[PDB]
Amino acid sequence: MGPGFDFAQAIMKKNTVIARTEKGEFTMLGVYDRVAVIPTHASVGEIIYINDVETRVLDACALRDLTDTNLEITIVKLDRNQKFRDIRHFLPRCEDDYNDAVLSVHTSKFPNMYIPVGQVTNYGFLNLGGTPTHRILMYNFPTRAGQCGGVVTTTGKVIGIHVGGNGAQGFAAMLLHSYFTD
Residue of 142, 112, 115, 109 whose CA lies nearest to 20:
109
CB 136 within 8 Å of CB 172 = yes
Method of determination used here? X-ray
C-beta of residue 96 within 8 angstroms of C-beta of residue 117: no
Resolution (A): 1.3
Exposure string over 69-105, b if 16+ CB within 10 A, otherwise e: ebbbbbbbebebeeebeebeebbbeeeeebeebbbbb
**Adjacent-strand bridge partners of 70:** 64, 133
Active-site positions? 41, 72, 148
Distance CA 162, CA 176 (A): 14
The Cα–Cα gap between 161 and 21 comes to: 17
Whether the CB-CB separation of 35 and 79 falls below 8 Å is answered with no
Contact 27/15 with Cβ under 8 angstroms? no
DSSP H helical ranges for the chain: 3-15
SS3 144: coil
Q: Of the candidates 4, 29, 35, which has an alpha carbon nearest to the alpha carbon of residue 15? A: 29
Look at residues 44, 85, 70 and name the one whose alpha carbon lies nearest to residue 129: 70
H helices of 51-149, in order, are: none
Measured CA to CA, the distance from residue 137 to residue 162 in angstroms comes to 9
Are 54 and 105 within 8 A, CB to CB? no
* Closest to 53 measured CA to CA, from 32, 81, 74: 81
* Furthest-apart CA atoms within the chain: distance in Å: 42
Can you list the pairs that 62-67 forms with residues at least 24 positions away whose Cβ atoms lie under 8 Å?
63/179, 65/134, 65/135, 67/134
Other residues' Cβ atoms within 10 Å of the Cβ of residue 9: 15
